[PDB]
Design a protein around this ligand. Structure first.
Ligand SMILES: NCCc1c[nH]c2ccc(O)cc12
Length: 153
């Protein structure tokens, strides 16, 4: 069935997602990103314009490390503060199904596919794959999640 890439797309709904678990950074056009990079959905429901803490991490020494930063949501903007030299800054939601996957423009201008822990082992990410392919174009793709990645904390 056809995908609908007309928005608008609402950041608080993207960041809340299915209402549980978290998202792995599955593919990106930015090189050098830490293997198994992920965010957890915030512990409490976000509504429009709010700021909240969230956990994020990556694989390190066989374990998923947890760090915290702040995320504030407005329109299609996910604004991250206090996450250092990777996740901090403005992420824009280009597409999302509010459930399993998102396609973003990251703060550096790169494109990103994020996939919910419930859907990460699927063979195809459906409409997000189609959207990520569109925006990524002929740019090199880096595959950040691998089947050896531990499960989310
Ligand atoms: N579901 C939104 C996944 C995601 C991508 N980039 C993010 C930055 C902060 C955040 O809480 C979440 C994200």
């Amino acid at each position: 069935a056809q995908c609908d890439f007309g928005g608008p797309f609402q950041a608080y709904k993207s960041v809340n997602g299915p209402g549980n678990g978290g998202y792995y950074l599955r593919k990106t056009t930015k090189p050098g990103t830490p293997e198994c990079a992920y965010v957890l959905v915030p512990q409490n429901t976000l509504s429009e314009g709010q700021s909240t803490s969230f956990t994020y991490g990556k694989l390190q020494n066989g374990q998923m490390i947890q760090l915290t930063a702040t995320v504030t949501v407005n329109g299609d903007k996910i604004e991250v503060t206090g996450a250092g030299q990777d996740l901090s800054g403005t992420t824009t939601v280009l597409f999302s199904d509010y459930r399993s996957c998102d396609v973003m423009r990251g703060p550096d201008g790169n494109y990103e596919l994020w996939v919910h822990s419930s859907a990460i082992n699927l063979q195809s990410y459906g409409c997000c794959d189609t959207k990520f392919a569109q925006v990524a174009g002929g740019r090199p793709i880096h595959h950040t999640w691998q089947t050896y990645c531990p499960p989310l904390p």
